[model samples]
Target: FTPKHQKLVNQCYPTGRTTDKKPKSSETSYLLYYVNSRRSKLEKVSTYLIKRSTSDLNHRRIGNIAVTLDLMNKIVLHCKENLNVFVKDFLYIMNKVLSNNNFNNDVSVVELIELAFSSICQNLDDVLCNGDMEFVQLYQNFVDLFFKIVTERIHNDDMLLKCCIDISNTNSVSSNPQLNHFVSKSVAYTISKFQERNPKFKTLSLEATIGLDKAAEDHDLSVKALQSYFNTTETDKLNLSIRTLLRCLQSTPNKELLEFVCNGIPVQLRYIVILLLVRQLSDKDKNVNPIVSLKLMSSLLVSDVSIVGLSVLDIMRKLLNFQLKNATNKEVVAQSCITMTDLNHKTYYAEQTSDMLYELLLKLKSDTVKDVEKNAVVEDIDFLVEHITQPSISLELFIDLAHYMKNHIICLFNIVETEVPSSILFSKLYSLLRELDSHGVQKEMMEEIFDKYGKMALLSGLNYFLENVSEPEYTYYSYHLQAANFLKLNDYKSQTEYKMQTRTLFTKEDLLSYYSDTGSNKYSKKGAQILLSRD
Candidate 1:
């Protein structure tokens, strides 16, 4: 639309085949172009990296790998003579070869790199002669290159061991007759070095492994590759797979995949990942276990993937509002159950709102008596109660409102009645009563409270209200009416399971069978005597 953009845009589209929709772009030989543009010497070196790029994206840039290696060999041979001028070029090619993860497996390709680097370190040290500040500095710089070349050679023994593991998938490595020579030499030399190299570090190494705490299928080409992974790999592969599976489940785009992935993982890790899905609800830390040792005791390979570090009540707050939009997202469903349930099943509207609230109430009671001066816990509890109870005031949430009535509400008065200040008990338990009383008030729990502790409950409130001293805004009329609230709860009538009773009688099932044998039937004289006798 602008004159400047149109002027530049016309360079790409010169003819009248202009934009009716967004324009399409054409691809080109950008790999060779950039190479030759940089320098003629780098042209062959760049193709390998280009192939690597194409392969990872699941595309291919066809060419002979042998030709690629040959070209690198010719280039390295030419570079060694004018060492300083082309030293960086050798490094650039060396880095390009190592960048591919498969570089370590290919011997011929890596051998050439080893020769180039060996030349550099041997030649450069002559420039970096013996001595402290300058001498040690130069030594430190070049010594690393010498050491790295040694490790690459060391890494070949690792490759041969891996080769044997892979070769087990079929049969023997008789293709190379002298293959056993260096391997035998490697093992004996390594054992000798370790005997002298070890100090207390051996114990330290053993203890670390003790505190932390595969397979052969003999004969297919594919099987060789697999054994290489199982036998020679240094990674904690089981842990790796667990993390892999975990991310797969985490990225599950729909409910249809939930049950399948959920069933595949170990139950220990299954639960952990399900716990992680609570990030959909919230990213609270209260859902995980708290102690430091317990963290190690569980499948604690994942320090980064913890649920929460607080109490379950915090997780409850997260799940209560986190809508389970897809009902089958059983990870979230599962996430909420163990994350928030009370043993008695706080089924408020088949919801757990009161279960969470009761925990909050109990949490405050503990926080207060800890005498930890940590006042904000109750404030958080209050914020949660009011937060969840807001938005829509009716129809579903207070499903377990009655659970709070006695489980939390009545216990509120008795459990910490005297342990905390008489003034301290009002807000949480009192408003629980006040809000639920007005919101969805249960007559049943009220009757139970009155039947059990109504007299003491009222008297406590009355005692606090008509106080012996000035408690200030502490228990002053921010709440002064629990007894008055209980007054309306006196209407319900019931004969229920509070005490015990018996209704069975000792009687004969078949009177005639007892009559002929011992005559212990109801109407018989023997039966009558048996029934009446103290003996």
Candidate 2:
């Protein structure tokens, strides 16, 4: 023992207790030896008593506690160099002081822990940054113990938030999953409390409620009250319950939690939250397996809850765009099918969405040299046309397809020549010209088709008009006019040729039924009046 230490021990413990003396150590002889031959024996016996007395005192006295904290602080300052040996004692003291009931209401004890915890929190980052794995475990050990005390025992919201924020602000948790969990738990708990209290107060207006400064004051007070509740409230069940839920959300998947997030979130924030979840789940760098998030979103699309159609449409639009740019033909086609499949099901935005899908498909067709699953795409188009309830929208789609195919008649012919029992192409062709003859084609569309495919499209229209106009029982003059217009547009003229014939008279009602029946054959009879005589 050093001379100064021995002198201090002698004064601190003037008389040694029986337990203070070691076995085989004679206190009488030792005191006599110190007085007569050797003073060192008295020093040893006094130092022993000092150690024994302090050990027995443990953490009972405020002075003793302060002295121990002071020494520990010094060790913490140099902990990096001796972290292996120092962390054990440091962690122990932190747990002892912070977790013990004696210091629960003591401000000084709280401050001491704050001091120690903050220092270690800072040092842990330095160790992690330096890649000191050996010391990292010790730092993690300290953090683990430290969080246990704060989250499990501490009642002061200010202190708890302070410590939680300190850990979060480090930005070192990514490398340490434990730290991440701790921070996430804290954040979850804070949010859960915020959520619980958020609905209690109505939204306050700045000018209507109060002046700017007064409003801020009220807000600050309200926030302070919230923190107070979070801190002083003795609800382990409540806080831990939230913490557990949040942790589950982070580490694993749960349906109840998913339902809560989907159905229970605030209305204005629902879209924003779903978008955030989508990005989170799809981000490869953040999640090892991201499918769960996508599945959650997928479920939402088909769920019974009233979903915002535009939001879903926007998502589909982005996915289709992504597929167009980066994905293969099969994937692109698959996404197109998905979009079309959902088109009729949405409550709103059908026209806008139909336009978007058609445009996407048009680009998909025009941008490629070969047809990409033409039969399937054609069937989907047929599905779209028949299922679309709006006449204008259906006409618009047919016109777009006509223009799309007009530029490449060879592709158009190849599609038309296919052998499906119910051909989409012929159906579209009949419906399209029927609409054209009824409403008259748009000048822009007419110019586009003529400018690109010219006579081929015009001839197709002319033949269709003639086939409808020449039936024995039909008497529609509009088809004749439409044919005349088509022929006139093509600078072609036609003559009506017929042999003289005798016909049975019929009522005007017969003409209506003939025109209405579209293709009736039971009402036709003719007899030649003169050979090759024309009207």
Candidate 3:
């Protein structure tokens, strides 16, 4: 809370009576006489009631609400003048009737409100059901005053948390269809205004806790309203709810309600909301706590039914940029896993997600972890490998199952030392090769992409595989090795040098001869036959 916040707080007073004890009977009678003398002059009475009044305290106001209602009944029995002032007094009288706390008996609060409204509905039908413009304006004024009273009582100097909870419950006593519709809409509009005015107050869950048994029911109503409103307004509702929920969470912070709201949101918005939540935690002057933040972000992004999008890889790249800016925090990697886990479970994107996981695993493998769990340095990795390695179907979302095999192969490296998973390496290199080999792209675009990924597959690794290998493996590795070497040397060197390199394997005549030779061509055909086998 800042000075500006405190300044805003000071402008409002609480809803209950003043601190001084109730006036003596002689004083009460004198005040009632003064009220009667004022007649249609409502401004003076309202001013006196606000300024020199004892209703600023809840116990005192609760007493006053009951007493005032009786006095109001006597006045109605007498039939006062047919004037707007009389209507204003009637509204205030009804407001006081609804304000009664019934000696702090929770059940009585509901019963009293129910009976009071019953009478109002019976006697004031002309005012409410007719829908006259003046009646509507008069009702609006009453609602405005009622909200002001509750706002002051709950949030202003009163600071009565109980009153804050009760303010929203004034009309919760009944389920009458017409009345519920009117009250629900009115309260929702007030809630919307409350959200706009204070985007960081945590009030909903606070009310939930205080209401105990009623909390669940109230939350259900809110959920229904939220869905209806979100569906009706097809605009940037996620952003709107983020702002509103931040306030609600600030005021209440109920874990259950927060999780419920999180579970109900649409998938795309859920991802966005989770990202925003990471930023929210960061804004709270919270220091880096990777494990907790990871849990929160994961729960936010990944749902039971689907991953938010088709490519976890693409989303990871975007979030990686967010992580770089907030590099002090490392929740980004955790978010990546959450995303991959969800993607793997889905039917459509599982293979693509697997390849992405493999690429990410390889990239992270060599980057030293400064904050290791153990001090005596080891090349540490996580559980991603074991999960990815479990058997699956086609990985040819990239190549002919080559991309699929990479993650599983890396999983092998986690428990035992093995050669780099070249198949996965090839998937990534093939991607880069596709980019570089792009026709008519701008040089800057090519250069930018190359700068990002070009060095990922080192020439030394390619050479190491080719020289140390035997026949079948050699045959498999050489195509990618040749392709990459071609890519590396394409930007420079002459055709003569390239031909010279090719000459070591075969000259132009030998190449032509191999194309027609029975033994070589027949063996080549046999190689294609071998690829038909599956692991």
Candidate 4:
């Protein structure tokens, strides 16, 4: 070694008094000078410093130890241009310290090794951003060595856990894909190994294992690591892979993770996860309940409604339409509908899904009316009404409920009172009733509403019908008699007042012709009142 190199090594690893005086100020400057100019000499000295720092005798001393650690960190920090050159030696020294059979178990040696890697990972980007391709290869080698050691040698949970803690404590693991993969696999391996030993582990604790907390806390890291388990074709492993993701999802529900579960799983296995979740909905296992999946699907629907959103809706449809062979199945189907409609409220498919669910509710009503306990159908309708805020849907639901429930149509009225009352709502109500009446169904609910609200409901429905009438004045005059009778239900004089108002809008001939155009079943008494009043 040159004189300058020899002198610098002595200063870096001084074997003098073990007192606590601070490291010489010039030592750091001299090291930086060599790092910038005398790269080859500095490399040799770096190798010498690492060897000296790991020596048992040096470990037995105390003075130069602090300086040695500080110098090593400075070498990595200052030697950016030739980081490839120094990092290779740095990683080699780290591997050597960590791989030493007798010393690997030593706490200080292990710490030194961890510190070496931690420092390297922390500065990886600074060195690699404009670094040589050769440096990148070396860096990749260091990462590969890391994962290899994690999978093969790192057995103690604490060590593996600490390794992850330190790795995650810095920003090194997530910056690059290759680095991320190794760290991710390391966690997977640690988890697999940890589980193999503790097969009956059930509860989730922050101190479950070395890296478990870190993995849980860093969701992005956990997601990538969990994804590493997917590069397989085996069924058992694939399910295990999905469950790991599901388990994380249950614990830490986030938007990114939810989106990944909906869109990231491969198309074929994706459905399997969905079925697994649906089965969990029915499963007795409280640990793997379906609510987790329910929430995940709901969150997914709340965002994108094009692909994943629609796909989740399709799944809910199946769950709702599933056969209610037993009470359990019945409850699960109802729960599915509840979740779907709840999600629909957050999306653009409110109208379409409400229509589909209306049909489903109709079928359910048809099927369940024969059963002694009809609450399941009522529960579903209640769930539907709770989620469906659209006015058109409210009216449609009312019309159907009116038909199905007959005199028991109070549920339909209750929903309208709470969910559909604004002017915008009444407009939709008016338009839909006319459209349904145009189909000539004249559903019973309309009559029930008319009976309950009297002329207010009658005029609301009749005026729209009159404005669209294409018949001649005489034929259309029937509207006047209908209006008079609707008013007559309230008072005897109401009939006279309504006809007088109708003549302003139509001629006396129109009123008389409309009154005569009705078939014989038409009331002659009501017509007599209208004709005499018109005169």
Residue-level lDDT tens digits of model 4 in 94-191: 55544545443344444445566666655555455344455555555655554456446654445455555444443434445445554454545544
What are the clash counts of all predictions, listed in order?
7, 0, 16, 2
lDDT, residue 321, candidate 2: 46
* TM, every model: 0.25, 0.40, 0.36, 0.50
**Deviation of model 1 at 512, angstroms:** 65
- What does candidate 3's lDDT look like per residue over 1-535, in tens digits? 4332222212222334532223245544444454456564344443333332234224444534443433334333333342334444455545543354433333333233333333333334333334446545445544454445445433331222222223223332122333333444433443454345444433433211322222335433333444433322233434555545644444445434444455445545455555555455446544433344444444434334233544456555544434444444334444434543533444455356446544544444445433331111111113344454444423232232223233233233222222233546444533433333323322232233233334333333233323333433322233333333435433222432453355433222322332243453433232222222212
What is candidate 4's local distance difference test score? 0.50
Q: Over the stretch 180-241, how does candidate 1's per-residue lDDT look in tens digits?
A: 22222222233223222432222211101111001132433222322232222222322332
lDDT of 1: 0.33
Consecutive 10-residue window with the lowest summed lDDT within model 4 = 205-214
- Which prediction has the highest TM-score against the true structure? 4
- Clashing pairs for model 4 are 161-210, 478-514
- Show model 3 residue runs off by greater than 4 Å: 1-259, 262-275, 278-293, 300-315, 326-385, 389-535
Candidate 1 wrong stretches, greater than 4 Å: 1-88, 95-245, 248-317, 323-331, 340-535
Model 3 score (lDDT): 0.38
| Models, CA RMSD each | 25.3, 16.9, 17.3, 11.9
Cα TM-score of candidate 2: 0.40
**Local distance difference test values of all predictions, in order:** 0.33, 0.42, 0.38, 0.50
